[PDB]
Amino acid sequence: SEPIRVLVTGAAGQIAYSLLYSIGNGSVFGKDQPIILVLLDITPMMGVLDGVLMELQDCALPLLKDVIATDKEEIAFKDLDVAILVGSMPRRDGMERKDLLKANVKIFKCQGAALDKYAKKSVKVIVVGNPANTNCLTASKSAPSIPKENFSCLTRLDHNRAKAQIALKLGVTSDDVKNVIIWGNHSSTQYPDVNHAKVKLQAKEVGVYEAVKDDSWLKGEFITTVQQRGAAVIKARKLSSAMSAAKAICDHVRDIWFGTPEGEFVSMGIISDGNSYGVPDDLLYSFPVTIKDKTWKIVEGLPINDFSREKMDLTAKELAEEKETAFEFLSSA
Amino acid sequence: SEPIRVLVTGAAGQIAYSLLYSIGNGSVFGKDQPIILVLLDITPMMGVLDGVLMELQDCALPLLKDVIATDKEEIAFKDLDVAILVGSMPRRDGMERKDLLKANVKIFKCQGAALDKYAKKSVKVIVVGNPANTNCLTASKSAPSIPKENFSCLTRLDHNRAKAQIALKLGVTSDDVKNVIIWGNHSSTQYPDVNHAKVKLQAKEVGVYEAVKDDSWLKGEFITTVQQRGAAVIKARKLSSAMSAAKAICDHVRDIWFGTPEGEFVSMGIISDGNSYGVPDDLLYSFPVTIKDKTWKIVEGLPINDFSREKMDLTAKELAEEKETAFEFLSSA
Ligand SMILES: NC(=O)c1ccc[n+]([C@@H]2O[C@H](COP(=O)([O-])OP(=O)(O)OC[C@H]3O[C@@H](n4cnc5c(N)ncnc54)[C@H](O)[C@@H]3O)[C@@H](O)[C@H]2O)c1
Numbered sequence: 027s028e029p030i031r032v033l034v035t036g037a038a039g040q041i042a043y044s045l046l047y048s049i050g051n052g053s054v055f056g057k058d059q060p061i062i063l064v065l066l067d068i069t070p071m072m073g074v075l076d077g078v079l080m081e082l083q084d085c086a087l088p089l090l091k092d093v094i095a096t097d098k099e100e101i102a103f104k105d106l107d108v109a110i111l112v113g114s115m116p117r118r119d120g121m122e123r124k125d126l127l128k129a130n131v132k133i134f135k136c137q138g139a140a141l142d143k144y145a146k147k148s149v150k151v152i153v154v155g156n157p158a159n160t161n162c163l164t165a166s167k168s169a170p171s172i173p174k175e176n177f178s179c180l181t182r183l184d185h186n187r188a189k190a191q192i193a194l195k196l197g198v199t200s201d202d203v204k205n206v207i208i209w210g211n212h213s214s215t216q217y218p219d220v221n222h223a224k225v226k227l228q229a230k231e232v233g234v235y236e237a238v239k240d241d242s243w244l245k246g247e248f249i250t251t252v253q254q255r256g257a258a259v260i261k262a263r264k265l266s267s268a269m270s271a272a273k274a275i276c277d278h279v280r281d282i283w284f285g286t287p288e289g290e291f292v293s294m295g296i297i298s299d300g301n302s303y304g305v306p307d308d309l310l311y312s313f314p315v316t317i318k319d320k321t322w323k324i325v326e327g328l329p330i331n332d333f334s335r336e337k338m339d340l341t342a343k344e345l346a347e348e349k350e351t352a353f354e355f356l357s358s359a
Numbered sequence: 360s361e362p363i364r365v366l367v368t369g370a371a372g373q374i375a376y377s378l379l380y381s382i383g384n385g386s387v388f389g390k391d392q393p394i395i396l397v398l399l400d401i402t403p404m405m406g407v408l409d410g411v412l413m414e415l416q417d418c419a420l421p422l423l424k425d426v427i428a429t430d431k432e433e434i435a436f437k438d439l440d441v442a443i444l445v446g447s448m449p450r451r452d453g454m455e456r457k458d459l460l461k462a463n464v465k466i467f468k469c470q471g472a473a474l475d476k477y478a479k480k481s482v483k484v485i486v487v488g489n490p491a492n493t494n495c496l497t498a499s500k501s502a503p504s505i506p507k508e509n510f511s512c513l514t515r516l517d518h519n520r521a522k523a524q525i526a527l528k529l530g531v532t533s534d535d536v537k538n539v540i541i542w543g544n545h546s547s548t549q550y551p552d553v554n555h556a557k558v559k560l561q562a563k564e565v566g567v568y569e570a571v572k573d574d575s576w577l578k579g580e581f582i583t584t585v586q587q588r589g590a591a592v593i594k595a596r597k598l599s600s601a602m603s604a605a606k607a608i609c610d611h612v613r614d615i616w617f618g619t620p621e622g623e624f625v626s627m628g629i630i631s632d633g634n635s636y637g638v639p640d641d642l643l644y645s646f647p648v649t650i651k652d653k654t655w656k657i658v659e660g661l662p663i664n665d666f667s668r669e670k671m672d673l674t675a676k677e678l679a680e681e682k683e684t685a686f687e688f689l690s691s692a
């Protein structure tokens with residue numbers, strides 16, 4: 027019950043258009059939490075942005091005390107509590123086309139630095155624009171004034187996907203599926219881990235492996251399914267996976283705002299420093315986490331097998347290489 | 360506790376894309392009400408829908424007992440409880456040249472017969488495809504077996520537009536504006552009426568006219584803005600209302616399902632037949648509504664000044680005008 031300043035960058039893009047509404051409804055921070063919405067995008071997008079601004083008013087949301095559009099970072103980053111960084115230039119290729127979209131990192135240095143300057147030192151930063159993990163890390167080195175801990179990336183999307191896959195298989199509901207784990211990079215190397223998942227079956231919560239009875243599946247194509255998903259959806263829709271990614275973002279923040287449910291944990295890419303898994307420190311890696319008062323704690327002491335350890339080694343090495351790679355991009359060593 | 364079939368035409372378009380997450384949520388028909396979501400589009404859009412079906416799974420929406428995508432309307436219209444008719448051509452600039460999007464009228468006529476043939480005679484038809492009013496008349500006309508009372512078109516984007524203009528102005532919240540009335544055509548000739556509205560100030564609930572203290576504003580530039588809004592968004596985004604229009608369908612549909620709150624009346628485009636307000640009969644005109652048991656009632660005994668008559672007459676003439684055009688097109692070749 028008192029205005030909170032929320033910034034959504036990339037605000038003229040596709041995910042933002044689906045996301046804004048939901049922030050507005052009070053689906054994220056409280057039916058009791060009034061928001062001040064800050065909208066940021068690129069100059070040439072400022073006409074569309076006003077359009078999108080008109081539309082948030084026309085929704086006539088009571089929570090929304092104010093709404094702002096901007097091209098300028100002072101306004102954008104001034105006094106925030108929450109920053110959601112969706113902004114970035116569209117992810118693809120490598121050689122099949124766009125060689126190496128790493129210059130999206132020149133953008134988060136610029137954002138971390140702005141966060142550094144104007145934002146409230148308690149600002150929670152959530153990085154959605156890809157490559158999520160490495161822009162977020164990058165954004166954290168530029169924001170030395172803001173804590174390591176309140177920088178996170180999005181993996182929830184992959185985490186929700188995994189759950190939907192499981193449900194499909196067993197013919198239950200995605201709400202019947204606890205403790206899925208997404209490990210590592212939001213990428214082609216993500217490790218959807220169900221060695222620790224549960225599923226309501228009967229009046230029993232059995233256990234993902236127990237339940238599926240088909241191990242090879244959970245260790246292959248299951249993993250593939252979840253990785254392919256973003257492309258598949260774009261394959262069909264021909265557009266951004268907006269409704270589902272906006273939902274995942276909502277969850278990502280809503281879970282930081284209210285905490286995780288009892289007995290359960292969620293995936294969030296955070297800073298590895300002090301990890302108990304054997305994952306290099308000073309990486310922006312995704313882990314099983316629990317959250318109390320806007321504070322995450324890596325779940326610890328989970329049995330980690332052979333398959334899992336390898337998979338977790340592979341995703342680390344890639345994150346590691348993207349870090350080495352962003353660092354000559356970036357303006358300091 | 361038993362599913363209803365809800366139809367959403369133009370299910371592979373822009374407003375449908377913003378609306379579907381909110382039907383699926385329980386936030387339109389209730390948290391304890393399952394839907395069998397029927398989706399309709401044109402043959403060439405089926406791959407898109409497949410795509411959208413994909414995101415719907417990823418969105419964990421248990422209320423959705425089923426999701427039917429079709430291009431057959433012996434399929435799409437069959438056994439309906441609610442039909443939501445978005446599907447059609449959207450206005451594009453040179454929306455400010457000529458708007459005889461007549462492109463559209465055949466689709467409503469044909470969809471009404473379909474409704475006649477296949478939907479439950481209790482179906483409640485919600486028409487969104489523009490021109491809202493006139494499409495709604497064409498549809499009801501072709502659906503004799505369905506009680507004309509069952510048809511209403513969308514003017515709640517307008518209603519909320521005006522509420523929104525009041526709020527900015529007074530600096531209250533949307534929730535703080537009440538009993539607004541949108542009269543006539545979903546057009547630049549609509550009338551955002553505030554003679555019967557009430558605002559909630561810290562000291563007391565007052566007339567808008569009284570809180571504002573600027574008649575010229577309300578009789579002039581308040582008016583102008585709400586009637587040119589739709590066109591102002593298209594100029595901005597290069598697309599027409601989606602976020603805001605979706606949000607408003609929800610509202611419209613919700614008041615119907617659970618009734619309007621007491622002391623509160625909403626705008627809805629219902630059949631003219633029998634107004635206590637001087638409006639000609641046999642028109643699809645926006646009036647002030649009360650809803651109890653999914654049945655709307657016009658608000659009567661509201662004194663109409665001259666200024667207000669004027670505005671109401673201006674709009675019933677464009678409605679008429681428009682009717683002439685439609686029914687000439689339909690019986691022409
Ligand atoms: N982490 C995940 O789960 C996940 C999933 C899907 C997409 N994403 C990523 O989220 C981001 C958004 O995707 P989209 O579909 O919304 O893209 P989009 O192309 O529709 O919109 C992106 C917007 O960013 C803007 N932009 C560019 N540079 C900017 C800057 N410096 N500041 C602010 N805005 C700026 C563009 O002008 C555009 O308006 C992309 O990085 C996308 O690949 C991540």
Ligand SMILES: NC(=O)c1ccc[n+]([C@@H]2O[C@H](COP(=O)([O-])OP(=O)(O)OC[C@H]3O[C@@H](n4cnc5c(N)ncnc54)[C@H](O)[C@@H]3O)[C@@H](O)[C@H]2O)c1
Nearest residue numbers: 369371372373374400446447448449450487488489600604
């Ligand atoms: N009255 C209002 O408040 C309001 C506000 C905004 C838009 N609209 C109108 O709503 C309609 C939707 O526009 P838009 O921006 O959502 O989407 P859009 O134009 O991007 O897509 C709408 C979809 O309708 C489909 N369609 C066309 N003919 C069809 C048919 N015969 N059967 C089924 N589907 C069919 C198209 O294939 C398209 O996928 C337009 O008429 C627009 O002008 C009304």
